């Protein structure tokens with residue numbers, strides 16, 4: 093099972109639901125540019141090691157491509173291509189003037205020192221400089237990359253560019269000291285919370301006082317639970333990590349659970365709470381369930397047991413298509429993954445706008461703009477869901493691919 097083949101299959105199953113020409117589909121099934129480079133760095137012991145780096149630009153009909161950089165030992169070209177393809181639809185569904193992009197280096201950064209990490213970031217920029225830029229390709233943080241590496245990459249790009257333009261805007265997720273944007277740390281969770289609120293409004297539910305269960309307690313899951321409790325007024329009854337789950341009918345305080353996890357490395361054995369595991373955690377009687385962890389967690393094995401009225405897929409592809417079916421005929425509103433967690437890329441777009449313009453916004457302005465963007469995206473996807481009587485993930489694919497196809501036709505790339 094190849095990641096890129098899965099992405100192409102999903103695109104074809106989507107195209108089954110819309111009027112798109114075969115030449116446009118063939119165009120969309122292939123990345124428009126793939127760059128594979130050697131990334132040589134000098135190790136701390138004095139030797140030179142060469143790493144493999146990627147930069148895939150799937151499509152740029154709608155504007156400059158956008159996508160993060162992953163530093164993973166299991167990184168492959170096919171994974172980067174699939175993620176760039178998904179980034180295209182992610183920026184299209186939330187209506188950004190972006191295409192799809194993705195980069196990566198096959199490296200285990202946990203065994204690299206800080207100096208070696210900086211050398212790796214600078215060497216990656218020196219290798220891929222010719223295909224990136226503020227108006228060509230804007231990288232961002234991803235798995236095992238963080239704002240510190242983003243700042244190193246921006247500095248190297250500015251050094252090569254000789255400060256002839258907005259070098260701050262070449263890469264997003266930067267520290268606030270150098271062109272960073274406010275509200276970027278809790279972007280994904282804020283977008284997920286906005287989508288959950290709109291979904292509840294669509295379903296006729298006032299979320300104040302009902303239960304939410306969150307799986308995965310990284311930055312996405314923890315902030316999802318926290319913002320749910322404050323903004324949506326819901327009760328957080330269950331959380332879990334890479335070890336096990338903790339459940340409390342009376343409600344868990346996300347700050348205390350985060351303190352527990354930091355102190356002991358796991359959320360397990362939290363005071364006044366029943367210790368459980370992920371598999372039985374997935375089926376608590378809650379109004380909202382937010383899987384925010386590893387992929388492929390809801391499957392036909394346990395899809396029928398799911399009892400959440402709203403499922404918000406913060407993670408990337410937590411739900412299999414079959415589970416999508418059973419969840420649909422069960423009567424449950426699923427927020428598609430690349431619509432639910434599109435808040436991060438939206439706030440990255442806001443950061444890029446601030447960098448390009450040279451004028452920086454406040455927390456309130458970023459928050460309000462993100463609210464409007466995410467509300468509009470959710471409502472367009474839901475209206476397509478109603479009108480075409482398709483699954484809501486298929487509606488998200490219809491919206492995104494329709495936008496990209498229109499942009500491609502407008503440029504004259506495809507004549508039909």
Ligand SMILES: N[C@@H](CCC(=O)O)C(=O)O
Nearest residue numbers: 312384385406407408433
């Ligand atoms: N990668 C995150 C969610 C997606 C994102 O951060 O964009 C996770 O697996 O929890």
